[PDB]
């Protein structure tokens, strides 16, 4: 990136290097996307997760008891 580059020149390097695609792969963004999706959960979709983690947990325990 050239020093002091104006907005057009940084945009040229932005699209060429693909900063947005690399940021989505970055683990910092996945934690952010997990956080935003968690915060948008309504009360009825909170009742799914209580029911739904229970179903997932049951296959975890016979696997855990196996080993």
């Amino acid at each position: 990136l050239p020093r002091g580059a104006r907005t057009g020149a940084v945009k040229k390097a932005w699209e060429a290097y693909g900063v947005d695609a690399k940021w989505k792969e970055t683990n910092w963004a996945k934690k952010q996307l997990q956080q935003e999706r968690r915060q948008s959960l309504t009360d009825f979709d909170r009742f799914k997760v209580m029911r739904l983690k229970k179903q997932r947990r049951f296959e975890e325990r016979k696997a855990l008891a196996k080993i």
């Binding site: 915060q39 948008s40 309504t42 009825f44 009742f47 029911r51």
Partner: protein, 170 residues
């Protein structure tokens, strides 16, 4: 009337306070699942039927899902949840019947001898049980189609650790 005014009790002046219809919040719609916060059915999730006058709300359980009958409740004492159920097939004529104000409102030997005794719990009436069944018949059949709503409505709302209601989206 009959009597001359026997004292100097002045009549009140004509007050300028006309009664105007109550405008409910946008989140209250027919079919919205509601969370009761006060009363004997606190914490219970219920389904709204009709918005009545002066902040009163007509709400059913339905009875076979959680146990809440046809009842009234105040708007400020309830929380509206983003899930909305369908009321296709529900009798609007029967709902308009149970929305009337008269519905939920209504010296001898036996009078003297029952002084101090605790009154016996009178049971449910035939019409109250029959109107309940007529309203709910198309209601829980609607509830079975949407997945996990039956266990949702039979459950009770509560707050866990870290549950901050100013951040919870309902």
């Amino acid at each position: 009337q009959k009597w001359y005014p026997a004292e100097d009790e002045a009549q009140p002046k004509k007050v300028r306070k006309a009664v105007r219809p109550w405008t409910p919040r946008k989140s209250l719609q027919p079919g919205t699942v509601l969370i009761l916060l006060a009363g004997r059915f606190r914490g219970k999730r219920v389904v709204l039927l009709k918005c009545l006058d002066q902040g009163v709300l007509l709400v059913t359980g339905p009875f076979k899902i959680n146990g809440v009958p046809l009842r009234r409740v105040n708007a400020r004492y309830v929380i509206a949840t983003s899930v909305k159920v369908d009321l296709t097939g529900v009798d609007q004529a029967k709902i308009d019947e149970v929305a009337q104000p008269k519905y939920f409102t209504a010296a001898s030997e036996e009078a003297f001898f029952k002084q101090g005794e605790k009154p016996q719990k009178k049971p449910v009436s035939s019409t109250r049980a029959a109107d309940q069944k007529a309203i709910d018949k198309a209601l829980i059949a609607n509830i079975k189609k949407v997945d996990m709503l039956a266990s949702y409505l039979a459950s009770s709302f509560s707050l866990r650790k870290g549950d901050k209601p100013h951040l919870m989206k309902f």
